[PDB]
Amino acid sequence: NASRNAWKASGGIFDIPQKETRLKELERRLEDPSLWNDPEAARKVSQEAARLRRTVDTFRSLESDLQGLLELMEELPAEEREALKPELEEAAKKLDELYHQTLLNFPHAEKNAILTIQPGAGGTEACDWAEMLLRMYTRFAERQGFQVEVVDLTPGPEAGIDYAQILVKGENA
RNA sequence: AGCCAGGAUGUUGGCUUAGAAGCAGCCAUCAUUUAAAGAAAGCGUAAUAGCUCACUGGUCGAGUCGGCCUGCGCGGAAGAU
Ligand SMILES: [Mg+2]
Secondary structure, X not given: XXXXXXXXXXXXXXXXXXXXXXXXXXXXXXXXXXXXXXXXXHHHHHHHHHXXXXXXXXXXXXXXXXXXXXXXXXXXXXXXXXXXXXXXXXXXXXXXXHHHHHHOOOOOOOOOEEEEEOOOOOOHHHHHHHHHHHHHHHHHHHHOOOEEEEEEEEEOOOOOEEEEEEEEEOXXX
């Protein structure tokens, strides 16, 4: 578990050479008012600043909860340090949040989607496969607190489903 | 009606924004020092800044303002021997 945590934390370090240098560059050339006179430049700096800002708030957890863990977590987990081991649960959560953030933020990523499922060759077998696939996606939606709206469903003759087109809506679908 | 002066403070109201400081918007449209000063009507900017305006004090020293009813006119109004 500890090892896993460490591994997770290493990713966060992975974005230390990005944040510092970038920040420095931004303050050095972009922050300036005579650079600012061009809107595009300003916009660029703002984008650049965004990168910096992400790195600031979320790295603290990685550093602050790592360094404070070892002194109290070493020998005792059950007695007196039952808070102190599940104190690192908070850290884990933070890490997860960071990772998830990294994953998302990209174009159109919040707006819900409408996946069509199309079968392949095999004919009868294939339709069953399609159905199975559909089922899995439905269950995923169910799992993740989504609401699925069933639009197209088309049965195949010998068995299964030929064509389906399923639209789910909610939080970063 | 010109003319001379002010045209402030909390305050750059917060935000979301890239930034937003009356003036991109979205929204609240309040209170201060009071003669009076819009969380701002226009220009202006990255945006501030800056330049006007509202209202208000002075100067001057008689009429003035924009509706209503009706009279007669103007524009709108270009064609082929
Ligand atoms: Mg006529």
